Amino acid sequence: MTDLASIAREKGIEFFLISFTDLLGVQRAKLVPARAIADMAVNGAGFAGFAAWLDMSPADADILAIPDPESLIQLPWKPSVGWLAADVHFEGRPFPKAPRVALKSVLARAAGKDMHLKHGVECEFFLIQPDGSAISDPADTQAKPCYDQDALMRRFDVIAEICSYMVDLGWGPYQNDHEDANGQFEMNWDYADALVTADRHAFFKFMVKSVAERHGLRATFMPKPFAHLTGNGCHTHLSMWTAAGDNLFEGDGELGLSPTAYAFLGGLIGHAKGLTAVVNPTVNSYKRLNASPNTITYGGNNRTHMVRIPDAGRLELRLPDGAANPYLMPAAILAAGLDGIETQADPGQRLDIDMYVEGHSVEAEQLPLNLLDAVRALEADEVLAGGLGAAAAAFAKFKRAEWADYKSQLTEWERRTTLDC
Amino acid sequence: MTDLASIAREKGIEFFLISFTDLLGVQRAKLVPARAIADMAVNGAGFAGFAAWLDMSPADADILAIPDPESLIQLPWKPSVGWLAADVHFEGRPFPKAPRVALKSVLARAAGKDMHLKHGVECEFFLIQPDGSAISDPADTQAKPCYDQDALMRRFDVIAEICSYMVDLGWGPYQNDHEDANGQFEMNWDYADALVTADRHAFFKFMVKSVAERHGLRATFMPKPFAHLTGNGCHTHLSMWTAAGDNLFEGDGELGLSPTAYAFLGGLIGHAKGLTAVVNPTVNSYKRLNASPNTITYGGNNRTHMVRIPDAGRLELRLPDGAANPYLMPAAILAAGLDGIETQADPGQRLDIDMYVEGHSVEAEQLPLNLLDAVRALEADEVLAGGLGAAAAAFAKFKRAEWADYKSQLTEWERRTTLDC
């Protein structure tokens, strides 16, 4: 197609943002003027990977980040800037420690079996005061705030703005909601090819953060930003397709699922523990797993299990929180799912229970309850560790560092509880 | 001898404090007038153990705390109050979950082999502002404050007072020091029969806390009370004796130790991990083990190993911190030591290294680095768990609760590091 330089001329783009996601979900970007896009579209932009979360050294050569021209997004709030998602290349080949590179690998394995992952994201977020002390709306205070029309329309301006951008960009948004915590929201768009979805996820986090700042607010995807309120989820909708456009998950077993889906499901259940460290990747993530419901169970149309079946041909994975890496998250679910399929794994009986009331009477395999045990879990699950490749160890290394960091902090809790021993 | 009522008349005691130490080292006491001492000396004082750290229920009968008349201490700063240490009795028998009861059990086992434990305590403590924000002396600020004559004599009044009390009570004190952190002190008295020492430890913590308050200050034994300073140790000096007054630890092997001592030592090294949860019993304890030196090694005249040999017939155990239970600490070291002796256990080679410089090159068995792993360690070491009896599980239960408590706190560290994911 027409080179990025040519688009830059027709559509009036003055600068490109060349962007990649590192192991921690941090967006690293670089701002290049149009007069330079041509050269980089082809050779990529040069960063020093040791400065980002990539487990590299100062002595290594600068990595090259090659833009995916198919990913261009003209910032709807600032049209002269062109945003681009990029693969980090190192010494010729794509760098297997960058998340988009790892996602694209797992996809290629699945591809060569005529299996195509498609997923949707439920990115919840709070809107907060710029200084982070409190939610953005002091009038949002009732016990059960969910779907509060009052508080919802109080933030219409910023919501509507971002939703309309999504309409224009073609993501096909269909709903905007106030969620179950004061100050918390969700905006939903259509499911798509994993890679498409992933980019959209990385960009959505940027847009909402960016737009909210322009309205003198702040967006946070943090798992548990307030001691007194529920946290941010990032539940995921999954479906496997053939190139021929057929839903491999749709079938005639129970609930409308095929045997293939139930092996995929078995894969999830099989790797739930190590999978946990990846979609609950921060010390803060583990407040949510210590409310009650930390047990490994599906499913059915029921919001009380680690997995839900909403409809024929779909699994909802109610495990990942807001801190989830947009590329590392699909990547790792895919790994565990392809295993389910390749080892014809057994999910076990369904359970139509409400686990909040009747989950104590069920004997159930339990998820890890803190980062360290979670990392330990990922480190032992070699099937998983292999599906992500060199990334897995890098991740584990960083998160073991973060653990130590958090544990070295002197809390008021320590001093209140121990000053008197 | 003359009943406590008679002493009360000669020595002018108006009230008795009947005291016991619970699983957390908390001193539970009760204030009884002299007119009532007679009855309680014999039947004990009635508390409801469910209200203290004893793993009991409201439905249980009130425990009885029988004073040990041999332990009387007339508060040197308030002579009309008589302090007494007590065994918690429950339903006839001594309650095996109370620390003094557990210490006295292990001692009785050792006793029936003509083995008598004797130990000294190095109780370090900071003096702080009453509100706990800072050390008590703003003029104590140099890099290497240890043995600072200036700052030492700046707190002469309160030190000298407490030291002189110890002279009068017969504990045989021999030195008072400013320790290696700003605001931190140590006062040393003679070693003695474990049980004697233990009471003296429980009372020392009370006296220093009490006297310092009378001087408008505050004492803390907390492991790590300040982010910027070193912590409180509670190193212990150990020696085994026969009734005939002979030091079973004194011999002709290396360094002047007998084979018996080296099996005891082996016992320690053998149970170091599970022993850790007991003498490092708080979430706060684990800052000190994550400075560098968390490795299981003795020894010799060297302050870099988990164990030190200062002289013929003595082991110094450099493992316990200020939060250590005065009864649970001897109790548990004794257990691990009697095992060493009964299984003729092997400590391994000595190592005359400085572990701060040359400890990374040694392959060494590593202690647990956080409360939970520590509790796990104690739970698996059944030899140890058996030597303390019913206490061990109670302890483990409480500390697993404390862990959850600490992990449920929302720190500023979480919010600074995660608000932006």
Numbering used by the authors:
A (entry chain C), B (entry chain C): 1 to 291, 301 to 430
Sentences reproduced from the published study:
Monomethylamine (MMA) is an important climate-active oceanic trace gas and ubiquitous in the oceans. The recombinant RhGmaS was active to catalyze the ligation of MMA and glutamate to produce GMA, with ATP and Mg2+ as cofactors. However, gel filtration analysis demonstrated that RhGmaS is a dodecamer in solution, which is consistent with the result of electron microscopic analysis.
To gain insight into the catalytic mechanism of RhGmaS, the crystal structure of apo-RhGmaS was solved. There are three monomers arranged as a trimer in an asymmetric unit, with each monomer composed of 15 α-helices and 13 β-strands. In the crystal structure of apo-RhGmaS, the electron densities of residues Pro292-Trp300 are rather poor, and we could not place these residues during structural refinement, indicating a relatively high flexibility of this region. During structural refinement, we could not find the electron densities of the N-terminal His-tag, suggesting that this tag is flexible.
